Design a protein around this nucleic acid. Structure first.
Lengths: 93, 303, 107, 308, 152, 82, 218, 98, 107, 93, 82, 98
DNA sequence: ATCGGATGTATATATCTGACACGTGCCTGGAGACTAGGGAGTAATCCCCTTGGCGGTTAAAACGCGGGGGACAGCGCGTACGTGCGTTTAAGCGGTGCTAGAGCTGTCTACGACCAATTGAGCGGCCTCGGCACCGGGATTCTCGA
DNA sequence: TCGAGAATCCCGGTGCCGAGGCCGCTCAATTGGTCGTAGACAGCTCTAGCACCGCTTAAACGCACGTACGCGCTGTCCCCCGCGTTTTAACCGCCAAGGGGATTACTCCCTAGTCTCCAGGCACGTGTCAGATATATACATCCGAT
């Protein structure tokens, strides 16, 4: 059964931050579960706020607002800046 | 239909007779009265056997032992008294009823006594020690008649409050309460010979045979007169199946058991026929009337 | 027409295609914005960077290359904002970060 | 549901043949025969408490067992020690023979049950299957025609009361493959259904005819299986109803009383006693009254109709 | 469930309530075990009949001098307990009732159950609002301070 | 119009009134300001999150439904405001 | 559209029965199972004098039908006389029932009675309106002289398992020889044609401008 | 001679009547000013619904009486009738508020 | 063209059509079970009945015709099941149920 | 602007249970908000479950299961009964 | 195969091990069984809810994702199991 | 002469090594039997994943050490080093578990 | 432990009212009817995880066993806190007045929706090998009696 | 308090399988049209908020003061820690059966989507009593003398 995960991108960004490091597959699964958790969190919050806004379209403004609702302080600030830079890069082409 | 004819007339109680009972062997007739005296008489010739005294007040009931050896006497002195019928000795005097004791009966094994009193409580008594083993606030009115079932497992009780209550013997458990849509003062009650039915007299010129397993009246018997006094009723079985009772009209009524129809009317008593007794073996019926008669009459039929 | 991943044009590591797939399959809206998966995936990559960095810090502090869940639990209970985000979350093989109470000490 | 203050140190009780009197043993070693609502007799039985008491069929004799391994027969009218015997391996139980009061079976602690007579001070040692049980309960059937003996190893022997010959046999199971200590064997005063209390806390109801037709070393199934599936509570003492269609168990763990039926086996009801009382003894009125002995105190549980 | 509650009520009715001499009048229903509010006190059980047959029965009892024990289930049915009933025929009335009558539907048949208006304690005499229409007069001795002096 | 120091605008009598409502008999002084802090901290979140809603609402006034959805997201939902 | 009625003759309208009311078109008898219920015919009288019958085919002792008239507002679950808009007879002894009140101003009823029902309403009692009851044509007498306004229709109430049926005039057994009274079928097709014209006039009103009717009297 | 009720007694009755009452126990305007002061920290010149701020104050006071309640309970486990700040702190700790 | 609402078809009060439109606009599933709105609305009817019933109990316990939110708080705090259902829920104008601890009473 | 509610329905069921007892608008809106919240509860739960079943359709069995998840014991039991009743009454349409 | 009394299968040494992990020095006996009860009560919910999931899952085996969604619904979510 | 460390000291080191260790502290099979016993209460003969039950036991023990932790804290506020059941009960109370 | 006095609180009463129950005309969401697709349901197949058992081990649990350590009870004091009464103070009513900003309608348009054609990023599966786990042994450091 | 001893840290060496890397092998991602439409935006209201200001007063702050709980200390009991021993069953490894889980392929019942019509719901007026409020009153309860 074709099961999808992210541990490959985990290894990728690890090498991006720590090239000389290994991981326990256990820890990879833990991190992936964490990925899923934050994803469902942000998605549910975005859908809920759009419902409050009666919006049927979830866009990057919703993304940023919901992250700010979820992440604290500089975590949220850095995340907002990063998402902004990335969507700018993608929209540049 | 019976043809009961007067054979022997018995008398001698200085006061109103309250009960007459045939000995289970049919050898004697015990007659109690308010004169504090009991009288044993010959059951076939009307021969006065003896008088047993010792009770301090009037006697409201007397009952034989199954072996025809003992007699319990419930008197208005609030006492019972167990007597040896052969010696006339007061073997026991049962104290504990707080008021006039009106009825008394032995268990089918003759080793136990049930007693009803004016105290509206039924007391259950030993015989060999004469000790009260149980006491029950049975009724809301003075008890009229108490009696055992065929074996001694059930005790039926009647009282002036109109209630007919069947109680467990081993536990005193009030098993059943028979009601007939009114409150007719029940002056007499007893089990059927087969223990399947119950005959109860109410003070409205009415007798009622109830099914125990059904708890409903099966048959009714009228034509007599009984509204104030404790008039006894007996099952005539030695010949045809009849229901014999006294009546306030000086008559001795005999109904058919099944058809409930009057099969004979024995006349000759001048006062209310207060007590009745059916012979256990012969077609003999002792009918005792009240003080305006003071006589007991033996009747013998051929069927 | 060569096909490059949209995350490449976003210059990111997590598959934004899989993201948007889960999004549409998630029953959140009738139609997902274009750059919304991009933004949220960027947030995800950033926070993963933060947590993995903390984990590597802990593991190297413990002179460990392979990072066991204990390191991650310790870092979790070491970051106050992350803890606040995850204090309601339980951690397998987490144990408890060393916390000693005052009156507990001997004399 | 009604207790009695007039008796103390209640340890074991036994109904008479007609459920009119109750002989209860006391820690002083006295018999208190109480009537169903005062004490009828007091007998100086032993200095040792009495742990086993049985009425005679005529009710004029009571067999009592002290903790001093002293068994004694007493006339209920007089209270005299008719006979007295002593054994090793202290007696666990006595039991008059239901159809011959001269005979009485005795289950001792460590030795095999022995059937004695009162006329002649003889004794017949009943056989033991495994020769190493050291704990076998035994009982007459309803008519005293057979003897049912259950060991600590789940083995069940049905002997004939006269010859002690093995007329039936089978071992009860814990389901999988294991044995269980036969806590007690009880019979019905009416019919042929009997019950077994075992160490598995599961009461097993059988019909003795089915064991007789099952023969020796067979697989007889129970008429019923009864337990507290909720609490998994042991049963210090159980007994049938007088008719034999209701069964009660005494949860000494929580001092409660469970009441099931026989045919269906569904739980009739539950009676809760004093949470602080330790349940010891249980008996049913033979003809809906239930006597309980707990912490030396007796309680009565009746059941009334719609009237009164 | 109303069926389960009704089974429980019919099981506990015989030991929950009693009938004794009443200071209200004659004999009446008293509480023998503390009854909680809203719980089933007692069914007024009896003969379930149609309404059109009431009068023919009533006049019948009027010809027999027997009092009518009838309660209107609804515009179509009545529980007549004159000849066949239960202890509920001895529930007095009070202007301040701790009980109240309600009709329930069990398996299609209607049952008139007196429930407890409040937490009733042992020994209390059970009384409800008969809601008898105003006639032209039965004096009341319920003892309540709000007593209308008359059921009607 | 720059505001300040309304935290101490919370009167100690008000605090003790709330405490009595909570069923408290004896209280120390050290609590109140501490209390206040917590209070602040508590509201510290919601308003922000609330205006965050208003953030996405693109509006200048703040509404109840904001704090409704906040307390909801804060797992402290409230009734009676739509 | 049209009000076409699923009936070969003017019969007991199925549209106005209770869900606990059974019919047998072998005799168009009506029966029930629990308590009382009410059914009505297809037609309804507004003026004039007319007449019908009820034939009873089964009347056990625990079976008591009731037969009479009832205006609309008559709850078809009630026993035909429980309200003030219904006037019937109880088929145990001839007893007039109205407002649930029974009155013995009547004759006696028989188990096999073929009962005739005459009723005259004029073109606050309706003036000169009355109801007369016959047993097999023999005059059982006047039932109700006081008759309230509003259209009435013949109705039958069932108790537990009652078997009765309504019947028109051309197959009668003891008919009155009056030239003015009308059978059930006649008033039936009269009302049917009237409602046909009602549909005509309503579709006219909504469809074409204008309306106009002759010199009012008829 | 002047009378003074024993300590707590008056406060006890205050507790009783406050569990009896249901309305707010905070003056409206001070709370509102505090809210707006907090608001300008995140963004200045923001308006509010009276309903909104009523909700804020009600929900706050609810959380606050809950905190007072379970801190009272903890102090019971602390066997004292006086409250201690550590009780509140550790209560939040158990409330996951740390 | 005879009309009959699904609520009447269920003989209930809560608007099956309205709640169906609501869940449709709620973006939870692509298709829906037609009887699911009926079922859920029935559940709502039930629970609302219980809570309002307890509320009215407290209300006439206080001789109050119109129910006050304090009645609501008391009701939701008395029942174990409903309190468990709404433990972390707060109620406007709720207040606290009567509760005095043992040691609070002077001896 | 039309704003839907259930005050009509809550008042209906009020009368159905208590024709005598009144209602306040504050508590009315409380009821409305509450039922909205619990409906969203059940909606999210059932959708989550069906997503676990990966079933794009949401049926009544899901509702029963998820309310059983939601309600404390006997309530649910009682609840499901009437619910069944409902669909039976509606399937018998 | 009917199971029972595995609650006491929880060893007091295990309980005190968990307590030491929680940083506890002195413990009383009365706790353990009490502890156990709580334990039971705690799991009392989840498994049921879990199998409730499995209920709707129409399956005979019980999976981790069940308890995942339970703890989620129980507000005690866990990571590392999909 | 035999040596015995002072009380707690050994338990103190146990605490230290347990905060050092991370694995489970419950025997697998007893926990599993308990789980299946609980399961048959709601439905009998239900199977499980070893991963599932491992998750059950891990999450349990986590909740349990959290309870032990904050009850330790409360007992600090109780000024005792011995634990009392009331501490656990009231902790659950603050944990909303009552 | 009681009684007397103070005080605070539950009650009846009167009226005021403004929420509030009630009824309307008008609107549109709901019902009713019809069409399609395709999610769901069923069934046969495979797999394969689980559940079951069996034997050997010991680390672990049970149990016992002092015994110092603290839970706890009590006991003195004192400081901090209720309280009732002073004081002054903003809180609330209320009513005024402006408009900034919600809040509504009407476009029009960019923007995914969606589908179709294309495929390489990614995933199951297969080696592989090296940090890592275990072990044994030596050296270090805490701790409890001087 | 300086050693003895004990639990621990660390070091080297052994052997392993998971971490990882690479390989077939897609379907899901991309690309590109194409279309109806969500909302972006403009442009109006109006109203609710926002502030103003005055008037009344219940409320708040502080004082003094009793006082009584918090706290601190002592001695006791018991009891749980630590260690020793004995018993056991968790574990672990292996085997085996099947029963369920997952899969795929059909098949079609039900729902989405459309269009029509209207009737229940909703905004909106409208009397009107549940209860808010105030007052005097009767009852309950604390606090101190006896």
């Amino acid at each position: 059964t074709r099961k999808e995960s992210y541990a490959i991108y985990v290894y990728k960004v690890l090498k991006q931050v720590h090239p000389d490091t290994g991981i326990s597959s256990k820890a990879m699964s833990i991190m992936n579960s964490f990925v899923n958790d934050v994803f469902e969190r942000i998605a549910g919050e975005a859908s809920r706020l759009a419902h409050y806004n009666k919006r049927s379209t979830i866009t990057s403004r919703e993304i940023q607002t919901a992250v700010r609702l979820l992440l604290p302080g500089e975590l949220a600030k850095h995340a907002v800046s990063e998402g902004t830079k990335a969507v700018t890069k993608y929209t540049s082409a | 239909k019976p043809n009961y004819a007067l054979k022997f007339t018995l008398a001698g109680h200085t006061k109103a007779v309250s009960s007459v009972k045939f000995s289970p062997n049919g050898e004697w007739l015990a007659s109690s009265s308010a004169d504090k005296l009991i009288k044993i008489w010959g059951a076939y010739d009307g021969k006065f056997e003896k008088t047993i005294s010792g009770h301090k007040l009037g006697i409201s009931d007397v009952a034989w032992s199954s072996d025809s050896n003992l007699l319990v006497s419930a008197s208005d002195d609030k006492t019972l008294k167990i007597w040896d019928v052969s010696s006339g000795k007061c073997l026991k005097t049962l104290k504990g009823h707080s008021n006039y004791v009106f009825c008394c009966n032995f268990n089918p094994q003759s080793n136990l006594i049930v007693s009803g009193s004016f105290d509206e409580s039924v007391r259950i008594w030993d015989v060999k020690t004469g000790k009260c083993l149980k006491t029950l606030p049975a009724h809301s009115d003075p008890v009229s008649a108490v009696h055992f079932n065929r074996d001694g497992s059930l005790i039926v009780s009647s009282s002036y409050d109109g209630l007919c209550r069947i109680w467990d013997t081993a536990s005193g458990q009030c098993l059943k309460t028979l009601i007939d849509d009114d409150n007719p003062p029940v002056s007499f009650v007893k089990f059927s010979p087969n223990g399947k039915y119950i005959l109860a007299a109410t003070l409205d010129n009415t007798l009622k045979l109830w099914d125990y397993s059904k708890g409903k009246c099966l048959k009714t018997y009228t034509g007599h007169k009984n509204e104030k006094y404790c008039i006894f009723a007996n099952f005539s079985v030695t010949g045809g199946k009849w229901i014999v009772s006294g009546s306030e009209d000086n008559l001795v009524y005999i109904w058919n058991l099944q058809t409930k129809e009057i099969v004979q009317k024995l006349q000759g008593h001048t006062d209310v026929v207060i007590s009745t007794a059916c012979h256990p073996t012969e077609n003999i019926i002792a009918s005792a009337a009240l003080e305006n008669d003071k006589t007991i009459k033996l009747w013998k039929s051929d069927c | 027409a060569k096909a490059k991943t949209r995350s490449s044009r976003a210059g990111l590591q997590f598959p934004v295609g899989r993201v948007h797939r889960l999004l549409r399959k998630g029953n959140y809206a009738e139609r997902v914005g274009a750059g919304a998966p991009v933004y949220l995936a960027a947030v995800l990559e950033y926070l993963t960077a933060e947590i993995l960095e903390l984990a590597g810090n802990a593991a190297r502090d413990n002179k460990k290359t392979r990072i066991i869940p204990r390191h991650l639990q310790l870092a979790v209970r070491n970051d106050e904002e992350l803890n606040k985000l995850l204090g309601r979350v339980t951690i397998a093989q987490g144990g408890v970060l060393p916390n000693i109470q005052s009156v507990l000490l001997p004399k | 549901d009604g207790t009695l203050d007039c008796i103390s140190m209640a340890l074991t009780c036994t109904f008479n043949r007609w459920g009119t009197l109750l002989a209860v043993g006391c820690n002083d070693g006295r018999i208190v025969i109480w009537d169903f609502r005062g004490i009828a007799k007091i007998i100086s039985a032993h200095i040792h408490p009495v742990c086993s008491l049985c009425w005679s069929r005529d009710g004029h004799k009571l067999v009592s067992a002290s903790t001093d391994n002293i068994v004694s027969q007493w006339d209920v009218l007089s209270g005299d020690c008719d006979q007295r015997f002593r054994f090793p391996s202290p007696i666990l139980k006595v039991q008059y023979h239901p159809r011959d009061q001269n005979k009485v079976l005795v289950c001792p602690m460590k030795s095999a049950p022995v059937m004695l007579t009162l006329s002649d001070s003889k004794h017949v040692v009943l056989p033991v299957d495994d020769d190493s049980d050291l704990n076998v309960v035994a009982s007459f059937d309803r008519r005293g025609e057979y003897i049912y003996t259950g060991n600590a190893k789940g083995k069940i022997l049905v002997l004939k009361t006269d010859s002690q010959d093995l007329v039936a046999s089978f071992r009860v199971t814990t389901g999988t493959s294991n044995t269980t200590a036969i806590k007690s064997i009880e019979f019905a005063r009416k019919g042929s259904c009997f019950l077994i209390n075992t160490a598995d806390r599961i009461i097993r109801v059988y019909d003795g005819r089915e064991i007789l037709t099952c023969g020796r070393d067979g697989e007889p199934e129970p008429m019923q299986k009864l337990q507290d599936l909720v609490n998994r509570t042991p049963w210090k003492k159980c007994c049938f109803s007088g008719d034999g269609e209701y069964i009660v168990a005494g949860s000494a763990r929580q001092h409660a009383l469970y009441i099931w039926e026989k045919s269906i086996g569904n739980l009739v009801k539950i009676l809760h006693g004093t949470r602080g009382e330790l349940l010891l003894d249980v008996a049913w009125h033979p003809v809906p009254i239930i006597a309980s002995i707990s912490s030396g105190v007796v309680s009565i549980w009746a059941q009334n109709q719609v009237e009164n | 469930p109303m069926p389960m509650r009704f089974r429980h009520l019919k099981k506990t009715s015989k030991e929950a309530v009693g009938v004794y001499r009443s200071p209200i009048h004659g004999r009446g229903l008293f509480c023998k075990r503390n009854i909680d509010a809203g719980e089933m006190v007692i069914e007024y059980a009896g003969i379930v009949i149609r309404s059109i047959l009431t009068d023919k029965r009533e006049k019948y009892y009027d010809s027999k001098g027997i009092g009518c024990y009838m309660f209107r289930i609804d515009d179509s049915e009545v529980v007549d307990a004159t000849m066949h009933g239960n202890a509920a025929r001895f529930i007095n009335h009070s202007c301040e009732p701790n009980c109240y009558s309600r009709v329930i539907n069990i398996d299609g048949q209607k049952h008139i159950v007196i429930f407890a208006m409040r937490k009733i304690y042992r020994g209390e005499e059970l009384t409800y609002d008969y809601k008898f229409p105003i006639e032209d007069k039965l004096p009341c001795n319920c003892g309540a301070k709000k007593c209308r002096k008359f059921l009607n | 119009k720059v505001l300040r120091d309304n935290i101490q605008g919370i009167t100690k009598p008000a605090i003790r009134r709330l405490a009595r409502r909570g069923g408290v008999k004896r209280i120390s002084g050290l609590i109140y300001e501490e209390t206040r802090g917590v209070l602040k901290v508590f509201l510290e979140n919601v308003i922000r999150d609330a205006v965050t809603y208003t953030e996405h609402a693109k509006r200048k006034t703040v509404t109840a439904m904001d704090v409704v959805y906040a307390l909801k997201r804060q797992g402290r939902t409230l009734y009676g405001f739509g | 559209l049209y009000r076409a009625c699923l009936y070969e003759r003017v019969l007991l309208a199925l549209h106005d029965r209770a869900p606990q009311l059974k019919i047998s078109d072998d005799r168009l008898t009506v029966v029930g199972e629990k308590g009382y219920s009410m059914v009505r015919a297809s037609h309804g009288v507004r003026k004039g004098a007319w007449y019908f019958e009820i034939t009873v085919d089964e009347m056990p002792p625990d079976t008591a039908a009731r037969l009479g008239w009832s205006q609309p507002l008559g709850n078809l679950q009630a026993p035909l006389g429980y309200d003030k808009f219904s006037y019937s007879w109880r088929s145990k002894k001839g007893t007039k029932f109205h407002q649930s009140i029974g009155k013995h101003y009547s004759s006696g009823y028989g188990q096999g009675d073929v009962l005739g029902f005459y009723i005259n309403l004029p073109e606050k009692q309706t003036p000169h309106s009355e109801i007369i009851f016959y047993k097999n044509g023999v005059n059982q007498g006047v039932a109700y002289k006081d008759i309230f306004e509003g259209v009435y229709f013949p109705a039958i109430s069932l108790y537990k398992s009652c078997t009765v049926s309504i019947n028109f005039g051309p197959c009668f057994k003891y008919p009155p020889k009056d030239l003015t009274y009308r059978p059930m079928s006649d008033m039936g097709w009269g009302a049917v044609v009237e409602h046909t014209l009602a549909d005509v006039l309503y579709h006219v009103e909504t469809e074409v401008d204008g309306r106009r009717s002759p010199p009012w009297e008829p | 001679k002047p009378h003074r009720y024993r300590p707590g007694t008056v406060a006890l009755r205050e507790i009783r009547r406050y569990q009896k009452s249901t309305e707010l126990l905070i003056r409206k305007l001070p709370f509102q000013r505090l809210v707006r002061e907090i608001a300008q920290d995140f963004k200045t010149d923001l308006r509010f619904q009276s309903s909104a701020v009523m909700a804020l104050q009600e929900a706050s006071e609810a959380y606050l009486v809950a905190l007072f309640e379970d801190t009272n309970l903890c102090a019971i486990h602390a066997k004292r009738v006086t409250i201690m700040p550590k009780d509140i702190q550790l209560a939040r700790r158990i409330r996951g508020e740390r």
